[PDB]
Design a protein around this ligand. Structure first.
Ligand code: NAP
Ligand code: NAP
Ligand code: NAP
Ligand code: NAP
Ligand code: L8U
Ligand code: L8U
Ligand code: L8U
Ligand code: L8U
Lengths: 253, 256, 251, 259
């Protein structure tokens, strides 16, 4: 009885996996039988619950605090991961922040807060992933359906921050080929997390939420484990021949 | 189990050979009962069926030429008759064409579009009609839609598919059926081989395998695409785990 | 002179009424001689021809069903016969179709594709064969090919997605006579077709709600699509080649 | 008829000292616009462009500003309105090219590219919106490699994909002033930047003359020729005209039909 997309005796790291989409990727890869490094930066207990979750279903994990806005903290994060589990097969760039505002009101402090994590951060996560990763490995980065599909106004700073991700992946896949490493991006849609709720107020968390379901031909919201399942396939052996691509997981939204 | 289709029934057009075949075998290995459609290759159709039984699923092989819209309806009513239900339809059948616009006859257009564009349209259609709720539709395109020369006619036949799927996914939502396309690129079959001989300044001079190996250099993974490479993306897409991929075109080429 | 077409001859399919009449009047305005192609509406076409005569450019009406290839061949033979040259060729003629995928018929698909897709391909081919060196080919798509996905618009959208793939490759084939190929992909240009899809109240009221879609707060008119077409097929538009230009004003 | 002329309009182009920007700025002048020739390090060529524009019956002025420093950007737009009294058109053109494998790419090298190409352009568009007449025009410059694959080109190509995403949303925001925002995505326009990129992506570039590698890239165009600054400037011309209005929020690629 053939079991697909498994990751047994493979190590995976997932920036900002304490809560939200990243935490499901952390678990899924754990379920499909990867050992998992669960990076957080502000949510220490949240991360220890994800380490706990992955252990209960028969694989190992350690949480590692790191601000991935800080390239040396990223060097240490990858340096520490390989120190612990011995190697690293999978690196998922998940960590991100949202911003809202009309072009006229967007400040220098605000451009940077956003770009420092979502774009520079993810790029430098990807850098140390290539240096630290084994041959046949997997980088995965997170964009947004807004990058180019969705056209939310007063969403320019955020969308641009992920538009750069869209352009990194097709080229990274050329560069990363000489360690036989595939690079792909996932562009989630409206995944239900603390972030989705902060961007719906633009009332109740769930009342707002109940509108977005009436917009997917599948009449439900996207949830973190809907994106996780697409990253699990992509970091599997099976899905090696998807390379340099931005997958969009929105449900037809 | 994740990625498995235990209890599910599928149908794959042009699954006697090439990507078609590898799709059918993969769906089987995942737990699906596979309908295997051919139009000219019953021997390989019957081999595909037999390989699907051996690994311990079930299959039949119903002859049907998907240019003929009544042969498509029959293909599907017979699909539902033999296994009882249909969950999954994979529109895969296709022909390549080559030529400069200046030398493209009517006959050559009608040949290419009747199967690649129109045929696939009325597979998607008779899929929606015949499918259980929560089911799955896949159509096959090419990475060359959105630029090798003398490749207009075929290229545009698949650009139409890239357009259809986004809308279909709107239409098809009311039975919660997801519709996506795969845009394969450089996959080792008689179609890839008959192509490599045209878009390589030597072509007939070199050997299919010598050409095949030239193209291996193109991928940053430094290898060739094989039907099992594509089969696996479809399988995920038609798993319940692939649900939240909907209305999209996945190019599977290896960075090419 | 800026993007003027003084000394050129153009041909526009379905230029009797619609964006085409406007592309025809526009290429006229910029000093081109214009073949005006109709199939069903000679009285409209005659209005266009006069309006191009009336701002001091020559023009003719030629009946041709761009679904019948033989008639495409005659139209291009006769156009070169009259003006002795053809520099620009605009594939405009198209039809609209609504329906859930479950309802679409072989007949409906073939009514659409015959003209929207297959017709445009063969206008394009015949353009290549008759066109002077350094000439121009425009094909007509929709912002729905890809950009937007409306329910029950699958057939039409497909018809124009085919076009998007054609122009990229066409631009390479046609470059062996230094001819550039592009599509403009309109997006709600007020016309007789808009009023159909608009319907799916009065026309003018179904437009006032349409206005709110553009961040420029206004709908689209043939001139909006025509100015772009005039640029692409000018000398100065040469370096735009093998492209789709979605003219929607935001939408 | 005299079509897309910009008579009585005022325009600003960043880095209109050399390359594309200059041809952009000479084009707007030729089309009747009064032009503000921004530059950071090339004051003489900037001045030659102002004189070349004054020569064809319009007016121009060179302002110095480094569009890496956001306060120099505000100073640039404040000064430009001060001199000519208004501004209709804003062309974010300034940019740099970088080559390197992800691994070799550094913090310093990364900030160097993003601070001008991405951050710079964003804030040129912020201040343009704040200074521009209603009915005006924002253009940003992108690249045909942002999404249209070239090795050791991630950092450059990245910097520009951010622009593509920016112009689609800028179109909406800028709509409350009936302002069209659009990007041009140039290909390999012959410039000192093209020659620096023809040196790296050619079998043995330094063993070749810039013209040699040029002729080589020409054989790759369906138009058997190299694109030139005037080829992009002609397209910018259309976009910023009354007539180009219904192209809003899109990214146009001017490449001659290939790389
Ligand atoms: N609807 C959506 O959610 C949606 C849609 C499109 C794209 N995305 C993208 O999906 C990704 C994740 O979204 P989400 O919904 O999961 O977000 P979220 O719930 O707000 O969670 C944020 C995650 O980011 C981590 N993080 C933030 N700043 C960090 C830093 N400097 N260093 C390390 N980690 C940091 C957080 O960990 P700590 O709490 O430990 O800081 C947390 O795990 C983001 O890139 C987002 O843009 C999401
Ligand atoms: N290989 C590639 O590189 C590549 C790249 C892009 C896209 N594709 C697409 O992938 C699909 C598979 O092609 P392939 O590579 O597998 O090539 P292939 O080996 O040529 O396969 C052709 C398949 O098409 C079926 N077919 C042909 N005419 C048919 C008809 N009237 N009715 C039903 N089925 C018919 C054939 O069945 P019989 O011959 O048995 O009748 C055969 O199984 C096609 O959609 C193709 O356009 C392939
Ligand atoms: N209008 C829009 O909002 C919109 C949006 C996206 C795309 N488009 C595209 O824009 C183009 C023009 O559409 P429109 O809005 O101007 O449409 P329209 O008002 O319906 O005009 C149709 C034009 O097509 C011609 N035509 C139809 N069938 C023909 C045939 N067999 N042979 C020759 N000519 C034929 C008509 O001429 P006869 O009357 O002589 O038959 C008429 O000139 C079309 O290709 C359409 O698909 C339009
Ligand atoms: N040429 C191509 O092949 C090509 C292809 C695709 C895209 N592009 C893009 O098109 C644009 C034009 O490139 P190009 O070929 O014209 O390049 P170029 O010859 O290098 O010209 C560079 C321009 O950038 C300006 N610049 C540099 N740093 C600046 C700063 N801090 N502030 C203001 N201006 C600054 C320069 O002015 P100073 O003299 O003052 O530095 C000069 O005007 C760039 O955005 C480029 O990325 C070019
Ligand atoms: O991207 C996000 C959250 Br960061 C998003 C939110 C709401 C909707 Br409706 C669509 C979206 O793409
Ligand atoms: O279409 C085919 C073979 Br039918 C194809 C082959 C190789 C590449 Br790279 C792209 C393609 O689209
Ligand atoms: O398709 C049509 C008319 Br055929 C259309 C109408 C309105 C808008 Br907004 C976009 C469109 O594409
Ligand atoms: O942008 C650059 C380097 Br500035 C470029 C050069 C040549 C070609 Br072909 C495409 C490009 O995008």
């Amino acid at each position: 009885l053939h079991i697909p997309g498994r990751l047994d005796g493979k190590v995976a790291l997932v920036t900002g996996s304490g809560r939200g989409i990243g935490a499901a990727v952390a678990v899924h890869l754990g379920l499909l039988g990867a050992k998992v490094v669960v990076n957080y930066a502000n949510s220490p207990t949240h991360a220890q619950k994800v380490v706990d979750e992955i252990k209960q279903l028969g694989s190992d994990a350690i949480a590692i605090k790191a601000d991935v806005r800080q390239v040396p903290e990223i060097v240490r994060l990858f340096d520490e991961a390989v120190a612990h589990f011995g190697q690293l097969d999978i690196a998922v760039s998940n960590s991100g922040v949202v911003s809202f505002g009309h072009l006229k009101d967007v400040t220098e402090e605000e451009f940077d807060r956003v770009f420092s994590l979502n774009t520079r951060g993810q790029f430098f996560v990807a850098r140390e992933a290539y240096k630290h990763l084994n041959n046949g490995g997997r980088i995965i980065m997170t964009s947004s359906n807004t990058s180019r599909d969705f056209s939310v106004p007063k969403f320019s700073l955020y969308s641009g921050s992920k538009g750069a991700i869209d352009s990194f992946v097709r080229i990274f896949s050329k560069d990363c080929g000489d360690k036989k490493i595939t690079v792909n991006a996932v562009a989630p849609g409206g995944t239900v997390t603390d972030m989705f709720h902060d961007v719906s107020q633009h009332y109740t968390p769930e009342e707002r939420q109940k509108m977005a379901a009436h917009a997917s031909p599948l009449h439900r919201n996207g949830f973190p484990e809907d994106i996780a399942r697409v990253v699990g396939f992509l970091v599997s052996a099976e899905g090696e021949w998807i390379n340099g691509k931005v997958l969009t997981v929105d449900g037809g939204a």
